[PDB]
Amino acid sequence: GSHSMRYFFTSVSRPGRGEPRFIAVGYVDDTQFVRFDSDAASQRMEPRAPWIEQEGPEYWDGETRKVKAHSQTHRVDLGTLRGYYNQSEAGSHTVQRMYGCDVGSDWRFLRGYHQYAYDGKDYIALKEDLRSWTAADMAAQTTKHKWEAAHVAEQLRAYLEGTCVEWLRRYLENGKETLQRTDAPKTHMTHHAVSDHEATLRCWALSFYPAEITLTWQRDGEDQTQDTELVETRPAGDGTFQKWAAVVVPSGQEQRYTCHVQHEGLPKPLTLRWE
């Protein structure tokens, strides 16, 4: 299957009480491997996954070097935007940056990213052509201008179609056991009566990886979409994910309903039926 490497950056200004808080994390598919926290003691890029601890001091000194630069960068970004919108320096604001690359099953470049968001609204993003930008307002447009002269896109392109892909692949290899693993979900069904004329049907999908999944309920073959309780795929905390979907059923019809599970780690799609 295809894979990706993403870097999430969050900076929050805390006026009147120190320097803005900066958090940085990075992923390979759904596994986090490194992190950096401005409020932490180390003031260093730290590992968050086993398969990266191997990397020597060069890697850690380099990433600690780059990560700090990012922090400073978004520390300034807060300033700039604060002016781009004539905002009170009293209020706290947020800046989010997320860049990375995707590769197909062939481990070849498939598309890259580089997007921003100020206080939750899309600010500026790199288009697919990796050669142009999407400015939202006049502010983002002014930034787009700067990045156009500075020829930022071209540079970012090299990173995305090159270095980025190459590290993903490396990490993919060095982490074969984890990153390249798959765990078909462990599916089971629970039945608890709500009343003397109804029952709840819960379909479970546990300990699976990656997070991509499709858990569906069907009555006599028809999707019960709009009548299904579907929680967000959540993390077990052990590296695997969980998920469930439930429907309220008229006591006596449990057999009409079927749960359908779809996961990249299942030879064929699952079909469970209470009985």
């Binding site: 960068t73 270095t163 980025c164 590290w167």
Partner: peptide, 9 residues
């Protein structure tokens, strides 16, 4: 590994 260039808004 992080990108080595550090653009500004």
């Amino acid at each position: 590994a992080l990108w080595g260039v550090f653009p500004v808004l």
